[PDB]
Write a protein that binds this ligand. Structure first.
Ligand SMILES: *[C@@H]1O[C@H](CO)[C@@H](O)[C@H](O[C@H]2OC[C@@H](O)[C@H](O)[C@H]2O)[C@H]1O
Ligand code: NAG
Ligand code: NAG
Ligand code: BGC
Ligand code: BGC
Ligand code: FUC
Ligand code: FUC
Ligand code: FUC
Ligand code: CA
Ligand code: CA
Ligand code: CA
Lengths: 194, 308
């Protein structure tokens, strides 16, 4: 039978064991006795205008130049003109070639060229009655005096500069300090003796 | 107004005065016994004055109570124990502070006899002075003044207000659950992320397990949002070209035909013969074109399907 040959009619080819000789009926796209040679669909393909064509089984792949995309690379991709802002990944639709922007954090809109107002989301990120300030693609906290850090969470230690004098104890208070003078001293900074 | 990081707390526990005498040695409004020098008469009307100030190496006789002062009304006679009194705050003095707690302090507690008339002033029963260091804590420290003839006992602690932590009640932590963060505050004012969040601000959602790092992201915990051209639970499966019927992909918008399928959309049967058995009367089929066939008929049979 055809059993003696492990492989005859290689690609979707059905062996026929006729008395005169073996025969192969083959799936479309192949040709030859065993149907081992791929019909060139690129000689008749619709890949055009600089596309590198690659033969597939009853199909073809249009390798596209950079300024084009699609099944046939028949349309230009809008991502070549950089419609999306920096930080946004530009992707191309396979059907129409229109650019699809994926915005980074802080930006929105079709072109991702619009700031998000983080101060207009229903919450104040700033502690201690701080004022949310909107920044292009970001936000900031306008802290009160005595509070710093990105969210106004750190009490400034105004006693860090040692403003009190003559071994006075300095009191770290909100936005100011207070000196407590040793015996025999006076003044806001305990600077005047006796 | 009235900002505050915390408060210094003091409660008078007990006072003992069998004799009932001022620190002058004289009776609280009483006459001396002729024998044994006993005080006879009404007991002292004991109230307390408290003065809290900056810690001083040398205790001063003058100067202001810089950290605040307060006093109780008359809370007992000569001898009384309030350690078991629950729900009474007359023996309690609270001094709030709006500065970072220095941890060093000097404290003055005084017992006074309330005058019996309008004309006379009060007179002190016993005076105590204690300098030390104390950390914010909900546990009390008991102090006892027992050197003089009258003795009293009291307790102290420094409590931070809510959202304040550290030795100075100066470290802030306010829990939140909004766009800008999702955390609680532990004992030490450190932030502990709510479940499903991460990062120092606890504002970075922890995505669905197995979510593709490259092609997946989440704005909410347990979610997996796929970038353009990706799909599936993990966002790890490419999306074939739209209109791709019998094809698959390894990258988005590809269309790689399955077995015996052709065309850019893989919608063209390359084996219409084996699929439909179109030939009849033992006619033999040939996949002449995609979605097309041609039969070779036995002798005496004609037509595309070999019907006589
Ligand atoms: C550091 O020391 C200087 C003196 O050398 C002080 O003038 C500073 O205090 C000032 O900035 C902090 C504010 O809270 C104060 O009101 C202001 O006087 C001190 O930080
Ligand atoms: C707090 O803000 C002040 C601005 O006045 C700045 O000098 C300081 O470095 C800030 N501190 C931190 C921890 O960002
Ligand atoms: C928790 O807070 C303490 C301050 O009391 C700090 O030293 C520590 O670093 C914090 N925890 C961690 C894990 O860093
Ligand atoms: C390239 O970018 C421009 C805008 O700069 C847009 O109008 C085009 O459609 C795109 O191809
Ligand atoms: C603007 O806001 C972003 C978060 O959206 C933050 O990461 C930046 O540090 C800030 O400038
Ligand atoms: C603060 O008060 C000053 C006057 C000194 O007594 C220091 O020791 C104390 O910490
Ligand atoms: C034999 O004929 C070929 C063309 C294919 O249709 C096979 O499936 C069949 O077995
Ligand atoms: C195909 O050719 C036709 C005419 C018949 O001989 C079949 O048996 C064969 O498979
Ligand atoms: Ca081919
Ligand atoms: Ca912004
Ligand atoms: Ca401060």
């Amino acid at each position: 039978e055809c059993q003696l040959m492990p492989n005859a009619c290689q690609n979707g080819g059905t062996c026929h064991n006729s008395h005169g000789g073996y025969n192969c009926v083959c799936v479309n796209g192949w040709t030859g006795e065993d149907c081992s040679e791929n019909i060139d669909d690129c000689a008749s393909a619709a890949c055009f205008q600089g596309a590198t064509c690659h033969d597939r089984v009853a199909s073809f792949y249009c390798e596209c130049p950079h300024g084009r995309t699609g099944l046939l690379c028949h349309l230009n991709d809008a991502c070549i003109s950089n419609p999306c802002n920096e930080g946004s990944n530009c992707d191309t639709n396979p059907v129409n070639g229109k650019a699809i922007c994926t915005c980074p954090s802080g930006y929105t809109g079709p072109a991702c060229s619009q700031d998000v107002d983080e101060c207009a989301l229903g919450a104040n990120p700033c502690e201690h009655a701080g004022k949310c300030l909107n920044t292009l693609g970001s936000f900031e906290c306008q802290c009160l005096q005595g509070y710093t850090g990105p969210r106004c969470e750190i009490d400034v230690n105004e006693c860090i500069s040692n403003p009190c004098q003559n071994d006075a104890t300095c009191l770290d208070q909100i936005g100011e300090f207070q000196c407590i003078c040793m015996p025999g001293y006076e003044g806001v900074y305990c600077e005047s003796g006796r | 107004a009235d900002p505050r990081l915390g408060q210094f707390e003091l409660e008078i526990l007990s006072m003992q005065n069998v004799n009932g005498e001022l620190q002058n040695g004289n009776c609280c409004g009483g006459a001396r016994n002729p024998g044994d020098r006993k005080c006879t008469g009404d007991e002292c009307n004991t109230y307390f004055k408290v003065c809290l100030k900056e810690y001083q190496s040398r205790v001063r006789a003058g100067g202001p109570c810089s950290f605040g002062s307060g006093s109780t009304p008359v809370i007992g006679g000569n001898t009384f124990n309030l350690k078991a009194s629950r729900g009474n705050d007359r023996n309690r003095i609270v001094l709030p502070f709006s500065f970072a707690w220095p941890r060093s302090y000097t404290l003055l507690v005084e017992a006074w006899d309330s005058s019996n008339d309008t004309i006379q002033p009060d007179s002190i029963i016993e005076k105590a002075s204690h300098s030390g260091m104390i950390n914010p804590s909900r546990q009390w420290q008991t102090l006892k003044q027992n050197t003089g003839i009258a003795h009293f006992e009291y307790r102290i602690r420094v409590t931070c207000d809510d959202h304040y932590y550290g030795f100075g009640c100066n470290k802030f932590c306010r829990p939140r659950d909004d766009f800008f963060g999702h955390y609680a505050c532990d004992q030490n004012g450190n932030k502990t992320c709510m479940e499903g969040w991460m990062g120092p601000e606890c504002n970075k959602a922890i995505c669905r397990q197995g979510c593709s790092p490259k092609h997946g992201s989440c704005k909410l915990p347990g979610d997996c949002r796929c970038q353009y051209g990706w799909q599936g639970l993990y966002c790890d499966k490419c999306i074939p070209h739209p209109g791709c019927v019998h094809g698959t992909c390894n990258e988005p918008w590809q269309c790689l035909c399955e077995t015996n399928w052709g065309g850019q959309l893989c919608d063209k049967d390359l084996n219409y013969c084996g699929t439909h058995q179109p030939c009849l009367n033992r006619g033999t089929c040939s996949n002449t074109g995609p979605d097309k066939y041609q039969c070779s008929c036995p002798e005496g049979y004609s037509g595309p399907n070999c019907e006589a």
